Design a binder for this molecule. Structure first.
Ligand SMILES: [Mg+2]
Ligand SMILES: [Mg+2]
Length: 261
């Protein structure tokens, strides 16, 4: 597999968007695997954190929330917000550190007292703050919606997985809870189970669990803008299976090293 270099141009205008459906006390597109001790959802509110934490609840520290979002986001008046541009490609030119810095900068540019339409800002919070206040752990990856992760972010993921305590529970989310979230549930499952389970079985159980049946499907139309991105994602997950089979739980070699053999 090649070293992965292609990417989209970032989109504009970027606008702060209040994600009102994500403000509900239950997380959207939620699903879980008790055997893998993993779950996935859309980005969620302060009140929904207790729901996400249920499978762990008497062991708060063992929940690790993996935020997969490249685009910037946070909480204003407990409402999840996104700095949105088309396809959530606002930050598509930024590497991980740049994307993390950009989100800090945009949240810092908000002020208590600002009026954005009918909203008067009274509370500004990072998502990490909200997660950690609940006694849980937080890991940020930066993945572009519709695009596979870059190799170094896959390594970042693996390094985080290798450092997990026994009996960690991992919860993935992205803005919609489909696409990126499903892919990393697949990658996590392969890290643990590629050594014993088939590629097709792993894809099958995760598409079914996530009601995300076209996560890896390549459009029939080659002029559909998603076509090259889906081809890339498919190649990536197909080779990741081979890596994870050879290096269960990332033992002995990271993905990045594997690619550059
Ligand atoms: Mg709050
Ligand atoms: Mg640059």
């Amino acid at each position: 597999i090649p070293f992965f270099m292609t990417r989209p141009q970032p989109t504009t205008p970027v606008e702060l968007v209040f994600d009102k459906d994500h403000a509900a006390p239950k997380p959207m597109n939620y699903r879980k695997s008790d055997s893998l001790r993993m779950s996935g959802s859309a980005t969620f509110s302060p009140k929904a954190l207790k729901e996400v934490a249920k499978p762990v609840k008497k062991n708060k520290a063992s929940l690790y929330v993996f935020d997969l979002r490249q685009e910037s986001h946070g909480l204003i008046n407990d409402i999840p917000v996104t700095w949105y541009a088309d396809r959530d490609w606002a930050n598509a030119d930024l590497n991980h550190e740049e994307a993390v810095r950009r989100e800090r900068r945009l949240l810092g540019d908000l002020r208590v007292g600002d009026k954005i339409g009918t909203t008067a800002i009274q509370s500004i919070e990072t998502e990490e703050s909200m997660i950690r206040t609940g006694g849980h752990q937080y890991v940020r990856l930066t993945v572009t919606d519709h695009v596979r992760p870059v190799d170094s972010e896959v390594d970042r993921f693996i390094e985080s997985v290798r450092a997990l305590p026994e009996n960690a529970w991992v919860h993935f989310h992205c803005r919609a809870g489909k696409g990126r979230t499903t892919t990393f549930m697949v990658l996590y499952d392969m890290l643990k189970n590629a050594k014993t389970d088939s590629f097709e079985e792993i894809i099958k159980r995760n598409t079914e669990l996530s009601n995300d049946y076209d996560v890896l499907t390549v459009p029939a139309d080659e002029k559909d803008w998603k076509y090259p991105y889906q081809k890339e994602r498919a190649a990536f997950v197909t080779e990741f299976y081979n890596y994870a089979k050879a290096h269960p739980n990332g033992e002995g070699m990271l993905w990045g090293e594997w690619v550059l053999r």
